Structures are given as structure tokens and as C-alpha cells.
Amino acid sequence: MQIFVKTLTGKTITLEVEPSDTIENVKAKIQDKEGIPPDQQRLIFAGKQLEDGRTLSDYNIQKESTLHLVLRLRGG
């Protein structure tokens, strides 16, 4: 299952994530692929806030699905 995480700026990257795998596992891979901490970027889909402790199938996230990302400005 290779989905496409699209950010606000307009960055859609192909990221593979199992449906059972929680959002943390996704932000996890996305964190090691882009360098964005799980608690630094907020993802949204179908008007639902993807919580760190939530599954994908719950938000009807299919393959190549466009997952909205929100990069939290101001780091450290």
C-alpha cells in the first residue's frame, strides 16, 4: 500500500504504510524519509485529524491516497 502524502506547500511523496499500522508508523517512515518528527507534522484526511494512535482503514485511506500534511513551523 503506497500512498501519497501531500503537504500544504504542495509536496506529495510516495509513502508505503499498512492499513493496520497506526499514524505513528506513518509519520515514523515519513520522519525517516523527510525528517519531520511525528509530533511536528499533523496529517488530515477526509476532514479527519489523523491522531498518533489511529489506524488508516478508519479514515478510508486507500492506495496512492492523498494525505494532507501540516508542517509545524518554528523548530528548535
Partner: peptide
């Protein structure tokens, strides 16, 4: 088809500088 509608608000909402 209001997926980007509400998201568009988050774009500028996150891009703050002077206000």
C-alpha cells in the same frame, strides 16, 4: 469536495510573520 477548502485556511494560518 471541501477537502482543500478548509485546508487552504490552514496554509496561511501556519504561515505567520507579522499578522
Amino acid at each position: 469536495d471541501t477537502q482543500d477548502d478548509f485546508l487552504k485556511w490552514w496554509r496561511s494560518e501556519e504561515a505567520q510573520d507579522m499578522g
